[PDB]
Design an enzyme around this catalytic site. Structure first.
Site, PDB file in Angstrom:
ATOM      1  N   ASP A 132     -16.048   7.283   9.117  1.00  0.00           N
ATOM      2  CA  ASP A 132     -15.485   7.066   7.774  1.00  0.00           C
ATOM      3  C   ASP A 132     -15.721   5.647   7.262  1.00  0.00           C
ATOM      4  OD1 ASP A 132     -14.405   8.345   5.576  1.00  0.00           O
ATOM      5  OD2 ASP A 132     -12.302   8.044   6.162  1.00  0.00           O
ATOM      6  N   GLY A 144       0.795  -1.230   0.000  1.00  0.00           N
ATOM      7  CA  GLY A 144       0.000   0.000   0.000  1.00  0.00           C
ATOM      8  C   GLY A 144       0.826   1.279   0.000  1.00  0.00           C
ATOM      9  N   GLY A 195       2.386   8.376   3.798  1.00  0.00           N
ATOM     10  CA  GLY A 195       3.428   7.351   3.726  1.00  0.00           C
ATOM     11  C   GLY A 195       2.972   6.061   3.068  1.00  0.00           C
ATOM     12  N   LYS A 215       2.629   0.471   9.037  1.00  0.00           N
ATOM     13  CA  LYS A 215       2.220   1.713   8.385  1.00  0.00           C
ATOM     14  C   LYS A 215       3.224   2.800   8.733  1.00  0.00           C
ATOM     15  CE  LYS A 215      -1.656   5.119   8.102  1.00  0.00           C
ATOM     16  NZ  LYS A 215      -3.146   5.322   8.134  1.00  0.00           N
TER      17      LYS A 215
END
Lengths: 339, 614, 61
Positions: free
Chosen positions: B289, B170, B175, B192
């Site tokens: 969200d 991803g 980032g 992440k």
């Protein structure tokens, strides 16, 4: 009020006491001894260094064989030494770090020590199983243990910061006699040769003479201007010495009931921590916070010599029963034997 | 090496005091940690006869709770009653109350056997373990072992070398997400990363900050349906979140390949997202969200709710700002200056579920950037439903998509429990949905500006989540490392016998605390702290050197080249430095040395034989 | 303090009621003792080195 109809009685009785003594004061010891030969230059040297404690040494005590001694230290150990060789007979790790004093029993079978534990702990040096172990913990005092001395294997006299001394029965584990009177922490005590009497020294600046069997203060000696730290009997048992924070030693006589002598010098300003006599009593050795021990002529009041071999306070000392040797303990962590 | 190594058992002296200071040496606190439990049961099951049948009974109940069907529960309830109740009782060995016996029996006779049938026995078991049993536990090696492990935990400083990166999976806007394996244990994680240069450029510090704070509120409780965090840490250049791994990609991507989903397939994801939402709302967090792109798949096809950037803590103050993606926001949310809570997600869900079924938001009618049209259709068009929908599904969507909060599902009543009780989900057993046992419909295929007044915004960012770390350890290296370090110590015990072992120098005195540290003149020695001094020794000797409390003037923490140490100032104008092996050790030596010397000098000052004079 | 002054009195009652001796006698007797025991005091009258543990004595029991 009532109270000041007997506070005058007290201060009137203090004069009669002065008077009786002033009437005995016909000559001075200094005058009486002025004729005899000076002792000369006592120049002793260090013949052993005893090396084992990891910090300040607070108290030493020879055993009656003039050979073994015990020493109590800031490191939380007692060490029993064989002075003839420098070897260690025993290292005793204590339960409390805060030990201040130690004593060797006449028989050689026990040592005692205590400090801020407020407890005189007795150690059996010959267990019926071959080990060294606490055999009694004498609790009772309400302040710290400042000094203590065995009379025999079953009796011991202790002095405390609670202002009292006491005779103990080691098996009973209780105070068989209590000695109240002092108005300040008791710092030191010495037993008379016969062990019938004993003297104490305290921060009230006074020494007191006690009767062991009766439990009573016979006589009270004033004159020091500051705490008494150390005290010691003269060998015949008719007089005694004291050392104080006032930079002086004094010699008191029991039968004259007063002070015979002061040992001091304008150059000696720091305080005395310890005292004892040579075998004959002619010499009075005294330890100081300036890192020296001084040797006085007990009879003439002259400084005969100095023992200078410690790099910190001389905290304690002792002359052997056979008169051969002097031991000095120090905050520098060493003991030295001189002769 | 890159492997876990436990400190020596002597670490107990320091850790035990560290934990007592924080009130962490209690049955509750130890028993409710995974590694504390595991150590506590071993002590009970093998080394104390009175406690065996309490732990046995306890674990038999905990197994009973998890049983799925009533026929299973009817059977096991009897086995537990015959074994741990009627037997003990007949053997005059049943230390439980009269009421405890009658609670279970009153139910068993009526064949009524709910999961919580044995709860009264849970309490009383804990009572029987919490006293004498628990203290004997503190005396034993198993508590020493708790200390060794706890020491490691409280000493974690994570870097990049502590991980092994495999592949990228991803790109974010700030980032990029990576796949990695933690060397320690072998546990597979996602990493992440964000760049502080980019964050500063695209102005999203508050977005970055919020995610760390919102992830800590979410990541306790081992929830299956949220991507959760085990760790976070800093480097001079980048922030890291070590999150749960998810190889499978997102539902927005799969909606692309597969096309709109069956009613029965949406139901599976629905079920899962709902339990993900129940989690955050129980902990006063609204996601805001919810959408397909924000739902990740694992290699089996099970799902987890993902980025928490825009989530909100409504425990104290309720949010009013419009936040979220425009086609899935609630009428409360859009309204300027109007407060809302867990209600917002239930509408979002309603929209996301409609999305999956038909390909677009109910309020989107192919308009790309004209957000406003999506907002007025949300506030006026109560959305229109095709005949193709089921009547079971019709009411679920209608319920979720009511514009007024006083009407909709999961809002006026009992939260997620109202959604679960819709007829659309009537087939489902939510214990099975939770245990991830329903079969998934889709199985994925083969795969220049940085200031110092910005670094301080990212202190307190490092974090380790105890519950998480302990789980990793328990499910991997724990058992083998326990047996391994047992093996060492037994031979160290066997070593010392021949070499004349120290009949330990700490015992039988007034030693406060002891353990290894290093000094200078580094030099690694073993220290013993006593009320009036600090001794130390090398190995094979007694302490032949020391420091007195009297001579210590201060105890400062000071930096010795990227390393924190203690700096004892000493009366002679002399300095003495000490280095510990772990933060707890450090913290506890600073504390105990300071209290010791302040107290020692207070004493000596009172004693005319000991204090110094002119 | 009430009873404390009373205990102080009867302590002084004792202290003041011992029969004393003149210092001249006190000092004479001390002086006599020292002289009698001076020959037995090794810090005044050295012994042979071979008899001193801390100089040259070799046999010990």
């Amino acid at each position: 009020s009532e109270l000041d109809q007997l506070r005058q009685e007290a201060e009137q009785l203090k004069n009669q006491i002065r008077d009786a003594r002033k009437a005995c004061a016909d000559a001075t010891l200094s005058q009486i001894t002025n004729n005899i030969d000076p002792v000369g230059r006592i120049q002793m040297r260090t013949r052993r260094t005893l090396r084992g404690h990891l910090a300040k040494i607070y108290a030493m005590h020879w055993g009656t064989d003039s050979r073994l001694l015990v020493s109590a230290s800031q490191d939380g150990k007692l060490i029993i030494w064989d002075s003839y060789t420098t070897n260690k007979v025993h290292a005793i790790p204590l339960r409390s770090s805060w030990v201040m004093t130690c004593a060797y029993a006449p028989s050689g079978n026990y040592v005692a020590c205590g400090g801020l534990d407020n407890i005189c702990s007795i150690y059996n040096l010959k267990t019926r199983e071959g080990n060294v172990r606490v055999s009694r913990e004498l609790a009772g005092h309400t302040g710290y243990l400042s000094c203590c001395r065995f009379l025999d294997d079953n009796q011991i006299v202790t002095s405390s910061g609670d202002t009292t001394c006491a005779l103990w029965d080691i098996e009973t584990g209780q105070q068989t006699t209590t000695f109240t009177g002092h108005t300040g922490d008791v710092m030191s005590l010495s037993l008379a040769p016969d062990t019938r009497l004993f003297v104490s020294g305290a921060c009230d600046a006074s020494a007191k003479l006690w009767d062991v069997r009766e439990g009573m203060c016979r006589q009270t000696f004033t004159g020091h201007e500051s705490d008494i730290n150390a005290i010691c009997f003269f060998p015949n048992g008719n007089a005694f010495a004291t050392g104080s924070d006032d930079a002086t030693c004094r010699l008191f006589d029991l039968r004259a009931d007063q002070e015979l002598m002061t040992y001091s010098h304008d150059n000696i300003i720091c305080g005395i921590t310890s005292v004892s006599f040579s075998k004959s009593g002619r010499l009075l050795l005294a330890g100081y916070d300036d890192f020296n021990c001084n040797v006085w002529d007990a009879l003439k009041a002259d400084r005969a010599g100095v023992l200078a071999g410690h790099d910190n306070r001389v905290s304690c000392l002792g002359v052997t029963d056979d008169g051969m040797a002097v031991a000095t303990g120090s905050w520098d962590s060493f003991l030295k034997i001189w002769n | 090496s890159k492997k876990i190594l436990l400190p020596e058992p002597s670490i107990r002296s320091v850790m035990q005091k560290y934990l007592e200071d924080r009130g962490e040496v209690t049955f509750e606190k130890i028993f409710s940690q995974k590694l504390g439990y595991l150590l506590f049961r071993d002590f009970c099951l093998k080394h104390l006869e009175e406690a065996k049948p309490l732990v046995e009974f306890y674990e038999e109940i905990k197994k009973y709770e998890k049983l799925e069907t009533e026929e299973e529960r009817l059977v096991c309830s009897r086995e537990i009653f015959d074994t741990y109740i009627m037997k003990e009782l007949l053997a005059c060995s049943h230390p439980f109350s009269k009421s405890a016996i009658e609670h279970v029996q009153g139910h068993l006779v009526k064949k009524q056997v709910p999961p919580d049938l044995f709860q009264p026995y849970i309490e009383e078991i804990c009572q029987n373990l919490r006293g004498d049993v628990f203290q004997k536990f503190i005396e034993s090696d198993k508590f020493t072992r708790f200390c060794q492990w706890k020491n490691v935990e409280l000493n974690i400083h994570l870097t990049m070398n502590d991980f092994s990166v495999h592949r990228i999976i991803g790109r974010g806007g700030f980032g990029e997400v990576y796949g990695c394996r933690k060397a320690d244990t072998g546990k597979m994680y996602a990493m992440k990363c964000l760049d502080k240069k980019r964050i500063k450029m695209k102005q999203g510090e508050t977005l970055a900050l919020n995610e760390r704070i919102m992830l800590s509120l979410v990541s306790t409780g081992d929830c299956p349906f949220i991507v959760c965090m085990s760790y976070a840490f800093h480097t001079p250049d980048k922030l890291s979140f070590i999150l749960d791994l998810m190889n499978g990609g997102d539902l927005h991507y799969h909606l692309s390949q597969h096309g709109v989903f069956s009613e029965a397939d949406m139901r599976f994801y629905a079920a899962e997202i709902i339990l993900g939402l129940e989690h955050m709302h129980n902990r006063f967090v609204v996601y805001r969200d919810l959408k397909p792109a924000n739902i990740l798949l694992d290699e089996h096809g099970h799902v987890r709710i993902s980025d928490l950037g825009l989530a909100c803590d409504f425990s104290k103050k309720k949010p009013h700002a419009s936040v979220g993606t425009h086609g899935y926001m609630a009428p409360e949310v859009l309204q300027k200056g109007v407060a809302y809570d867990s209600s917002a997600d239930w509408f979002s869900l309603g929209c996301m579920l409609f999305k999956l079924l038909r390909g677009h938001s109910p309020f989107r009618q192919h308009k790309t950037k004209d957000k406003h049209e999506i907002d007025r259709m949300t506030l006026t068009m109560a959305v229109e439903l095709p005949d193709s929908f089921s009547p079971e599904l019709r009411s679920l969507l209608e319920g979720l998509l009511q514009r007024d909060v006083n009407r909709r599902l999961g809002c006026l009543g009992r939260g997620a429990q109202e959604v679960k009780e819709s007829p659309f989900f009537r087939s489902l057993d939510w214990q099975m949905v939770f245990l991830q046992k329903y079969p998934p419909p889709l199985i994925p295929p083969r795969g220049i500006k940085l200031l110092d007044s910005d670094q301080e915004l990212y202190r307190n960012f490092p974090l380790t989540i105890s519950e998480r770390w302990q789980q990793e350890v328990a499910e991997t290296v724990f058992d083998t490392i326990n047996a391994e370090t047992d093996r060492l110590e037994a031979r160290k015990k066997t070593k010392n016998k021949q070499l004349g072992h120290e009949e330990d120098y700490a015992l039988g005195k007034d030693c406060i605390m002891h353990g290894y540290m290093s000094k200078m003149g580094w030099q690694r020695r073993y220290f013993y702290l006593f009320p009036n001094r600090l001794e130390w020794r090398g190995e094979g000797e007694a302490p032949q050197s020391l420091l007195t409390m009297e001579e210590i003037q201060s105890v400062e923490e000071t930096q010795i080249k990227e390393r924190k140490c203690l700096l004892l100032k000493i009366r002679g104008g002399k300095q003495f430095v000490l280095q510990c092996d772990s933060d707890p050790e450090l913290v506890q030596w600073k504390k105990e040395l300071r209290d010791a010397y302040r107290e020692a000098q207070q004493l000596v000052q009172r004693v005319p034989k000991m204090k110094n004079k002119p | 303090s009430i009873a404390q002054a009373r205990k102080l009195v009867e302590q002084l009652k004792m202290e003041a009621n011992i029969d004393r001796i003149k210092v001249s006698k006190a000092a004479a007797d001390l002086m006599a003792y020292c002289e009698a025991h001076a020959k037995e005091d090794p810090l005044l009258t050295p012994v042979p080195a071979s008899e001193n543990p801390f100089r040259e004595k070799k046999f010990f029991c």
